[PDB]
CSV table of C-alpha atoms in Angstrom, one decimal:
chain,number,residue,atom,x,y,z
R,1,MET,CA,21.1,16.6,-3.1
R,2,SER,CA,19.5,18.9,-0.6
R,3,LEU,CA,22.3,21.4,-0.1
R,4,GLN,CA,20.5,23.7,2.3
R,5,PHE,CA,21.0,27.0,4.1
R,6,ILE,CA,19.4,29.1,6.8
R,7,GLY,CA,18.1,32.7,6.6
R,8,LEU,CA,17.7,32.8,2.8
R,9,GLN,CA,14.6,33.3,0.6
R,10,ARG,CA,14.0,30.5,-1.8
R,11,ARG,CA,15.1,32.7,-4.7
R,12,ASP,CA,18.6,33.0,-3.3
R,13,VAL,CA,18.7,29.2,-2.6
R,14,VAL,CA,17.8,28.4,-6.2
R,15,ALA,CA,20.3,31.1,-7.4
R,16,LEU,CA,23.1,29.3,-5.5
R,17,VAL,CA,22.0,25.9,-6.7
R,18,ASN,CA,21.9,27.1,-10.3
R,19,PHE,CA,25.3,28.7,-9.9
R,20,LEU,CA,26.8,25.4,-8.8
R,21,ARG,CA,24.8,23.6,-11.5
R,22,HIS,CA,26.3,25.7,-14.3
R,23,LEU,CA,29.8,26.2,-12.9
R,24,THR,CA,31.8,24.9,-15.9
R,25,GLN,CA,29.7,26.9,-18.5
R,26,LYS,CA,31.2,30.2,-17.5
R,27,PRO,CA,34.7,31.9,-17.6
R,28,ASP,CA,36.8,32.5,-14.5
R,29,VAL,CA,35.4,29.6,-12.4
R,30,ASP,CA,37.1,31.0,-9.3
R,31,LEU,CA,34.6,31.8,-6.5
R,32,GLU,CA,36.1,35.2,-5.6
R,33,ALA,CA,35.5,36.1,-9.3
R,34,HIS,CA,31.8,36.3,-8.5
R,35,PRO,CA,31.3,38.8,-5.7
R,36,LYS,CA,27.5,38.9,-6.3
R,37,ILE,CA,27.1,35.2,-5.6
R,38,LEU,CA,29.4,35.4,-2.6
R,39,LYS,CA,27.6,38.4,-1.1
R,40,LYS,CA,24.2,36.8,-1.6
R,41,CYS,CA,25.3,34.4,1.1
R,42,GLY,CA,24.1,36.7,3.9
R,43,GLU,CA,26.6,39.4,4.7
R,44,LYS,CA,25.4,42.3,6.8
R,45,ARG,CA,21.8,41.1,6.8
R,46,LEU,CA,22.0,38.3,9.3
R,47,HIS,CA,23.9,37.3,12.5
R,48,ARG,CA,27.5,36.3,12.3
R,49,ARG,CA,26.9,32.6,13.1
R,50,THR,CA,24.4,32.0,10.3
R,51,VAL,CA,26.3,33.9,7.6
R,52,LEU,CA,29.4,31.9,8.6
R,53,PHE,CA,27.4,28.7,8.4
R,54,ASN,CA,26.0,29.6,5.0
R,55,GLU,CA,29.5,30.5,3.7
R,56,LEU,CA,30.9,27.2,4.9
R,57,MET,CA,28.0,25.3,3.2
R,58,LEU,CA,28.6,27.1,0.0
R,59,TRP,CA,32.3,26.5,0.0
R,60,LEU,CA,31.8,22.8,0.7
R,61,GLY,CA,29.4,22.5,-2.2
R,62,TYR,CA,31.7,24.4,-4.5
R,63,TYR,CA,34.6,22.2,-3.5
R,64,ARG,CA,32.6,19.0,-4.1
R,65,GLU,CA,31.5,20.2,-7.6
R,66,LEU,CA,35.1,21.1,-8.5
R,67,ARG,CA,36.4,17.7,-7.4
R,68,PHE,CA,33.6,16.2,-9.4
R,69,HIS,CA,34.5,17.9,-12.7
R,70,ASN,CA,38.3,17.4,-12.5
R,71,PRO,CA,39.1,16.3,-16.1
R,72,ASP,CA,41.0,13.4,-17.6
R,73,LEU,CA,44.7,13.8,-18.1
R,74,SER,CA,45.6,10.7,-20.0
R,75,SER,CA,45.0,11.7,-23.6
R,76,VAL,CA,47.0,14.9,-23.3
R,77,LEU,CA,50.0,13.1,-21.8
R,78,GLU,CA,49.8,10.5,-24.6
R,79,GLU,CA,49.7,13.2,-27.2
R,80,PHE,CA,52.7,14.9,-25.5
R,81,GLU,CA,54.7,11.6,-25.6
R,82,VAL,CA,53.9,11.1,-29.3
R,83,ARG,CA,54.9,14.6,-30.2
R,84,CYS,CA,58.1,14.3,-28.2
R,85,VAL,CA,59.0,11.1,-30.0
R,86,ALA,CA,58.3,12.8,-33.4
R,87,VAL,CA,60.5,15.8,-32.5
R,88,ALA,CA,63.3,13.4,-31.4
R,89,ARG,CA,63.1,11.6,-34.7
R,90,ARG,CA,63.1,14.7,-36.8
R,91,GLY,CA,66.0,16.1,-34.9
R,92,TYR,CA,68.0,12.8,-35.4
R,93,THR,CA,67.4,13.2,-39.1
R,94,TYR,CA,68.4,16.9,-39.4
R,95,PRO,CA,71.9,18.0,-40.5
R,96,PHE,CA,72.9,20.4,-37.7
R,97,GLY,CA,76.0,22.5,-38.0
R,98,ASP,CA,77.5,20.6,-35.1
R,99,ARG,CA,76.2,17.2,-34.0
R,100,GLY,CA,77.7,17.3,-30.5
R,101,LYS,CA,75.1,19.2,-28.4
R,102,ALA,CA,72.3,18.2,-30.7
R,103,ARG,CA,73.2,14.6,-29.7
R,104,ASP,CA,72.7,15.1,-26.0
R,105,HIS,CA,69.6,17.2,-26.4
R,106,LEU,CA,68.0,14.4,-28.5
R,107,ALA,CA,69.0,12.0,-25.8
R,108,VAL,CA,67.2,14.1,-23.3
R,109,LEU,CA,64.1,14.1,-25.5
R,110,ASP,CA,64.3,10.3,-25.7
R,111,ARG,CA,64.7,10.0,-21.9
R,112,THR,CA,61.3,11.6,-21.2
R,113,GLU,CA,58.7,9.4,-19.4
R,114,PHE,CA,55.7,10.3,-17.3
R,115,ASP,CA,55.4,9.1,-13.7
R,116,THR,CA,52.3,7.6,-12.0
R,117,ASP,CA,51.7,10.6,-9.8
R,118,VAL,CA,50.7,13.9,-11.4
R,119,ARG,CA,52.9,16.2,-9.3
R,120,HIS,CA,56.1,15.5,-11.2
R,121,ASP,CA,54.9,16.4,-14.7
R,122,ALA,CA,55.8,20.1,-14.6
R,123,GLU,CA,59.6,19.7,-14.3
R,124,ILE,CA,59.9,16.9,-16.8
R,125,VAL,CA,57.9,18.8,-19.4
R,126,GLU,CA,59.9,21.9,-18.6
R,127,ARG,CA,63.2,20.1,-19.4
R,128,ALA,CA,61.8,18.4,-22.5
R,129,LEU,CA,60.5,21.8,-23.8
R,130,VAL,CA,63.8,23.6,-23.1
R,131,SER,CA,65.7,20.9,-25.0
R,132,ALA,CA,63.3,21.0,-27.9
R,133,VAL,CA,63.5,24.8,-28.1
R,134,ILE,CA,67.3,24.6,-28.1
R,135,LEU,CA,67.2,22.1,-31.0
R,136,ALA,CA,64.8,24.4,-32.9
R,137,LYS,CA,66.9,27.5,-32.4
R,138,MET,CA,70.0,25.5,-33.5
R,139,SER,CA,68.1,24.4,-36.7
R,140,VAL,CA,67.5,28.0,-37.8
R,141,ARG,CA,70.9,28.8,-36.3
R,142,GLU,CA,69.8,31.6,-34.0
R,143,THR,CA,72.1,32.8,-31.2
R,144,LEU,CA,70.8,30.9,-28.2
R,145,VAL,CA,71.7,32.2,-24.8
R,146,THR,CA,74.9,31.1,-23.0
R,147,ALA,CA,75.3,33.3,-20.0
R,148,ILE,CA,76.6,31.8,-16.7
R,149,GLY,CA,73.7,30.3,-14.8
R,150,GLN,CA,71.3,31.4,-17.5
R,151,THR,CA,69.0,29.1,-19.5
R,152,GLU,CA,67.0,29.3,-22.7
R,153,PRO,CA,63.4,30.6,-22.2
R,154,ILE,CA,60.5,28.8,-23.6
R,155,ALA,CA,59.0,30.5,-26.6
R,156,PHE,CA,57.5,29.7,-30.0
R,157,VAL,CA,59.7,29.8,-33.1
R,158,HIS,CA,59.1,31.8,-36.3
R,159,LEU,CA,55.4,32.5,-35.5
R,160,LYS,CA,53.9,36.0,-36.1
R,161,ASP,CA,53.5,38.1,-33.0
R,162,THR,CA,49.7,38.3,-33.5
R,163,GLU,CA,49.5,34.5,-33.6
R,164,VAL,CA,51.7,34.2,-30.6
R,165,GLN,CA,49.5,36.5,-28.6
R,166,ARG,CA,46.4,34.7,-29.8
R,167,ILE,CA,47.8,31.4,-28.5
R,168,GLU,CA,48.7,33.2,-25.3
R,169,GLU,CA,45.1,34.3,-25.0
R,170,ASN,CA,43.9,30.7,-25.6
R,171,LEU,CA,46.2,29.5,-22.8
R,172,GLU,CA,45.1,32.2,-20.5
R,173,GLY,CA,41.5,31.2,-21.2
R,174,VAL,CA,42.5,27.6,-20.3
R,175,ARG,CA,43.9,29.0,-17.0
R,176,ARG,CA,40.6,30.8,-16.4
R,177,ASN,CA,38.5,27.7,-16.9
R,178,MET,CA,40.2,24.2,-16.7
R,179,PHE,CA,37.1,22.3,-17.7
R,180,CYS,CA,36.4,24.0,-21.0
R,181,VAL,CA,39.0,23.6,-23.7
R,182,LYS,CA,38.7,26.2,-26.4
R,183,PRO,CA,40.0,24.8,-29.7
R,184,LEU,CA,42.4,26.7,-31.9
R,185,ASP,CA,41.2,27.8,-35.3
R,186,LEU,CA,44.8,29.1,-35.8
R,187,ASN,CA,46.9,26.5,-37.6
R,188,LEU,CA,50.5,26.0,-36.2
R,189,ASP,CA,51.7,24.2,-39.3
R,190,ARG,CA,53.2,26.5,-41.9
R,191,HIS,CA,54.5,25.8,-45.4
R,192,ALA,CA,57.2,28.4,-44.6
R,193,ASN,CA,58.6,26.4,-41.7
R,194,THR,CA,60.7,23.3,-41.4
R,195,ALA,CA,59.0,20.2,-40.2
R,196,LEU,CA,61.2,20.1,-37.1
R,197,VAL,CA,60.1,23.7,-36.2
R,198,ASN,CA,56.4,22.7,-36.6
R,199,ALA,CA,56.8,19.7,-34.4
R,200,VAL,CA,58.6,21.8,-31.7
R,201,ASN,CA,55.7,24.3,-31.9
R,202,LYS,CA,53.1,21.6,-31.3
R,203,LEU,CA,55.1,20.1,-28.5
R,204,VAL,CA,55.6,23.5,-26.7
R,205,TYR,CA,51.9,24.2,-27.0
R,206,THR,CA,51.0,20.9,-25.4
R,207,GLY,CA,53.5,21.4,-22.6
R,208,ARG,CA,52.2,24.8,-21.9
R,209,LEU,CA,48.6,23.4,-21.8
R,210,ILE,CA,49.6,20.7,-19.3
R,211,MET,CA,51.5,23.0,-17.0
R,212,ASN,CA,48.6,25.5,-17.0
R,213,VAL,CA,46.0,22.9,-16.1
R,214,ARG,CA,48.1,21.4,-13.3
R,215,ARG,CA,49.1,24.7,-11.7
R,216,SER,CA,45.5,26.0,-11.9
R,217,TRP,CA,44.0,22.9,-10.3
R,218,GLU,CA,46.6,22.8,-7.5
R,219,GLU,CA,46.1,26.4,-6.5
R,220,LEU,CA,42.3,26.3,-6.7
R,221,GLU,CA,42.2,23.2,-4.5
R,222,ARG,CA,44.6,24.8,-2.0
R,223,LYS,CA,42.4,27.9,-1.8
R,224,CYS,CA,39.2,25.9,-1.3
R,225,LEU,CA,40.8,23.9,1.6
R,226,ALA,CA,42.1,27.1,3.2
R,227,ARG,CA,38.7,28.8,3.0
R,228,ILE,CA,36.9,25.7,4.5
R,229,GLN,CA,39.4,25.5,7.4
R,230,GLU,CA,39.2,29.1,8.3
R,231,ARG,CA,35.4,29.1,8.2
R,232,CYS,CA,35.3,25.9,10.4
R,233,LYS,CA,37.7,27.4,12.9
R,234,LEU,CA,35.8,30.7,13.2
R,235,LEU,CA,32.4,29.0,13.4
R,236,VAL,CA,33.7,26.8,16.2
R,237,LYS,CA,35.0,29.9,18.0
R,238,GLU,CA,31.6,31.5,17.8
R,239,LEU,CA,29.6,28.5,19.0
R,240,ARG,CA,31.5,28.4,22.3
R,241,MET,CA,29.7,31.4,23.6
R,242,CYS,CA,26.5,29.3,24.0
R,243,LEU,CA,26.2,26.1,25.9
R,244,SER,CA,22.9,24.4,24.8
R,245,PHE,CA,22.5,20.9,23.6
R,246,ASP,CA,22.2,22.0,19.9
R,247,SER,CA,25.2,24.2,20.0
R,248,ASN,CA,27.3,21.4,21.6
R,249,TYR,CA,26.1,19.1,18.9
R,250,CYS,CA,27.1,21.5,16.1
R,251,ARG,CA,30.5,22.0,17.7
R,252,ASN,CA,31.0,18.2,17.9
R,253,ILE,CA,30.1,18.0,14.2
R,254,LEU,CA,32.7,20.7,13.4
R,255,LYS,CA,35.3,18.8,15.5
R,256,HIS,CA,36.7,17.0,12.4
R,257,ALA,CA,39.5,18.9,10.8
R,258,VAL,CA,39.3,19.0,7.0
R,259,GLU,CA,42.5,18.9,4.9
R,260,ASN,CA,41.5,16.3,2.3
R,261,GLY,CA,38.7,16.1,-0.2
R,262,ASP,CA,37.3,12.9,1.2
R,263,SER,CA,37.2,14.4,4.7
R,264,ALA,CA,35.4,17.4,3.2
R,265,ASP,CA,32.8,15.1,1.7
R,266,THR,CA,32.3,13.3,5.0
R,267,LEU,CA,31.9,16.6,6.8
R,268,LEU,CA,29.4,17.9,4.3
R,269,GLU,CA,27.3,14.8,4.3
R,270,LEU,CA,27.3,14.6,8.1
R,271,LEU,CA,26.4,18.3,8.4
R,272,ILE,CA,23.5,17.9,5.9
R,273,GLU,CA,22.2,14.7,7.5
R,274,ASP,CA,21.8,16.0,11.0
R,275,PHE,CA,20.5,19.5,10.0
R,276,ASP,CA,17.3,19.4,11.9
R,277,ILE,CA,19.1,18.5,15.1
R,278,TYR,CA,21.1,21.7,15.5
R,279,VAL,CA,19.3,24.2,13.2
R,280,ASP,CA,17.5,26.1,16.0
R,281,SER,CA,20.8,27.1,17.5
R,282,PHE,CA,21.2,29.7,14.8
R,283,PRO,CA,19.1,32.9,14.9
R,284,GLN,CA,17.6,34.2,11.7
R,285,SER,CA,16.1,37.5,10.5
U,1,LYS,CA,29.3,59.7,-28.3
U,2,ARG,CA,30.7,58.6,-31.7
U,3,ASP,CA,30.3,62.1,-32.9
U,4,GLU,CA,32.4,63.3,-29.9
U,5,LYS,CA,35.0,60.7,-31.0
U,6,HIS,CA,34.9,62.1,-34.6
U,7,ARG,CA,35.3,65.6,-33.3
U,8,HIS,CA,38.2,64.6,-31.1
U,9,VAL,CA,40.1,62.8,-33.8
U,10,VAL,CA,39.6,65.7,-36.3
U,11,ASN,CA,40.5,68.4,-33.9
U,12,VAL,CA,43.3,66.8,-31.9
U,13,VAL,CA,44.8,64.1,-34.1
U,14,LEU,CA,44.5,65.7,-37.5
U,15,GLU,CA,44.5,69.3,-36.1
U,16,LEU,CA,42.4,70.2,-39.1
U,17,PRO,CA,41.2,73.7,-39.8
U,18,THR,CA,37.5,74.6,-39.5
U,19,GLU,CA,36.9,75.2,-43.2
U,20,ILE,CA,37.6,71.5,-44.1
U,21,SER,CA,35.7,68.7,-42.3
U,22,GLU,CA,33.6,65.6,-42.9
U,23,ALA,CA,30.7,67.6,-44.2
U,24,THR,CA,32.9,68.8,-47.0
U,25,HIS,CA,35.6,66.1,-47.4
U,26,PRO,CA,34.2,62.7,-48.5
U,27,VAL,CA,37.5,60.8,-48.2
U,28,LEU,CA,37.8,62.1,-44.7
U,29,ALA,CA,34.3,60.9,-44.0
U,30,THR,CA,35.2,57.4,-45.2
U,31,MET,CA,38.5,57.4,-43.3
U,32,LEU,CA,36.9,58.5,-40.0
U,33,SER,CA,35.3,55.1,-39.4
U,34,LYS,CA,38.6,53.3,-39.6
U,35,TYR,CA,40.5,56.0,-37.7
U,36,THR,CA,38.2,56.0,-34.7
U,37,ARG,CA,38.5,52.2,-34.3
U,38,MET,CA,42.3,52.5,-33.8
U,39,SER,CA,42.2,53.5,-30.1
U,40,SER,CA,46.0,53.5,-29.7
U,41,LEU,CA,48.7,55.3,-31.7
U,42,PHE,CA,47.0,58.6,-31.0
U,43,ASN,CA,50.3,60.0,-29.6
U,44,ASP,CA,51.8,59.5,-33.1
U,45,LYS,CA,49.7,62.1,-35.0
U,46,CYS,CA,52.1,62.2,-38.0
U,47,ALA,CA,51.1,58.6,-38.9
U,48,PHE,CA,47.4,59.6,-39.2
U,49,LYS,CA,48.3,62.8,-41.1
U,50,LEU,CA,50.4,60.9,-43.6
U,51,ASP,CA,47.8,58.2,-44.1
U,52,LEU,CA,45.2,60.9,-44.7
U,53,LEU,CA,47.6,62.5,-47.3
U,54,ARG,CA,48.1,59.2,-49.1
U,55,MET,CA,44.4,58.3,-49.1
U,56,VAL,CA,43.8,61.7,-50.7
U,57,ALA,CA,46.5,60.9,-53.2
U,58,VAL,CA,45.1,57.5,-54.1
U,59,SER,CA,41.6,59.0,-54.4
U,60,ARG,CA,42.7,61.7,-56.7
U,61,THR,CA,44.7,59.3,-58.8
U,62,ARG,CA,42.9,58.6,-62.1
U,63,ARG,CA,43.5,56.5,-65.2
F,1,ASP,CA,68.2,43.7,-35.0
F,2,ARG,CA,69.9,40.6,-33.5
F,3,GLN,CA,68.5,37.5,-35.1
F,4,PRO,CA,68.0,36.6,-38.8
F,5,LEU,CA,64.7,37.6,-40.3
F,6,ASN,CA,62.0,35.0,-40.9
F,7,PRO,CA,59.0,34.8,-43.2
F,8,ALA,CA,57.1,35.8,-40.1
F,9,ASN,CA,59.1,39.1,-39.6
F,10,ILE,CA,59.1,40.0,-43.3
F,11,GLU,CA,55.8,41.8,-44.1
F,12,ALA,CA,54.4,43.1,-47.3
F,13,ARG,CA,53.6,46.8,-48.0
F,14,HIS,CA,50.1,47.9,-49.1
F,15,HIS,CA,49.9,50.8,-51.5
F,16,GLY,CA,46.7,52.6,-52.2
F,17,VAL,CA,45.3,51.1,-49.0
F,18,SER,CA,45.2,52.8,-45.6
F,19,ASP,CA,48.2,51.5,-43.6
F,20,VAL,CA,48.3,53.5,-40.4
F,21,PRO,CA,49.9,50.7,-38.3
F,22,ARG,CA,52.9,50.4,-40.7
F,23,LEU,CA,53.3,54.2,-40.7
F,24,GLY,CA,53.4,54.0,-36.9
F,25,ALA,CA,55.9,51.1,-37.3
F,26,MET,CA,58.4,53.4,-39.0
F,27,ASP,CA,61.7,53.6,-37.1
F,28,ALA,CA,60.9,50.1,-35.6
F,29,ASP,CA,63.5,47.4,-36.0
F,30,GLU,CA,62.2,43.9,-36.3
F,31,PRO,CA,59.3,44.0,-38.8
F,32,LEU,CA,60.9,44.5,-42.3
F,33,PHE,CA,58.5,45.8,-44.9
F,34,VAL,CA,59.0,44.8,-48.5
F,35,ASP,CA,57.6,45.6,-51.9
F,36,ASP,CA,56.5,42.0,-52.8
F,37,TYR,CA,58.8,41.9,-55.8
F,38,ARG,CA,61.9,39.8,-55.7
F,39,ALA,CA,64.9,40.8,-57.9
F,40,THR,CA,66.0,38.3,-60.5
F,41,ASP,CA,69.5,37.1,-61.0
F,42,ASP,CA,70.1,39.3,-64.0
F,43,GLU,CA,68.9,42.4,-62.1
F,44,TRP,CA,71.0,41.4,-59.1
F,45,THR,CA,74.1,41.3,-61.2
F,46,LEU,CA,73.3,44.6,-62.9
F,47,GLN,CA,72.8,46.3,-59.6
F,48,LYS,CA,76.1,44.8,-58.3
F,49,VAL,CA,78.1,46.0,-61.3
């Protein structure tokens, strides 16, 4: 697709095109994480109108690519369900010191189900994980917290500190790049650990992964929409200084407010389609 | 440079006198490569001093 | 410190091998360093008596 700009040498155009082309192959996929690419857009070398237009075009293309590569959630949720059921079974088998609170925590583990919409996953996996951690701590009879209004924090059980920080690094890398999924060479199963503990460790890893992916995508999409809206409003503000046919045409194109991905795609396609009609309104060099 | 790192470790961490150094102490020469890699713990100089002592001890141990 | 030790917290000493991190870990609480030998029942009884 002919994603096109104004006031750029062809080398910068192919640089931007290649940057979008290889977005997922690099760490820290956030746009502000690459000040060189963002600055190549035209800052301080061109008039305000054209640099704003170029930034808006780049943001639209970046948002389109991100929405294109948004990954599949199904297999991870299925794995989480399977592991939750396994933890529940192992907990039902185990001879706890007192069966009372173990009973209701196992009931909570049994109650877990995923909704059709993706916005509710965080809280349900949070409660499932906290109940699983409470069960695991009970199994090795550690003094779980009981302060008023306090709750048990989510943490791995009986793993070495180095391995814990390695897993934290892996999850952080997942947060840096949603699309790449770095596998663990580290093995969470230990001969020195009870099967219940191993199952809880697997479940907590999967829940952390899900929460990280969801939160990262949500905030990235929010940022993209905010940037696009701000650029559109400022560019509309600038175009009102002139009153030619081409400038009025561009303003009417920018009339549509963008707060949804589909509206963003329509705006981008319309802006590309009628490029030759309004191009001369922008000065260059 | 790496030689500046070696000088820094020998003169600030080990506080070693001039008459003994890597040019004259082979076990120190072997240990410097490991010691320079450990960029933390430099506040705790006694740990490095004691490790140097026990490395000398194991080197001098003979059967 | 507060919680029972685990196979994760119990670490083995290395003798005749440079062990700077353990020497820095002196006066620390959680990581317990052991000699890799475990006392037999007879030795345990003899120590107790």
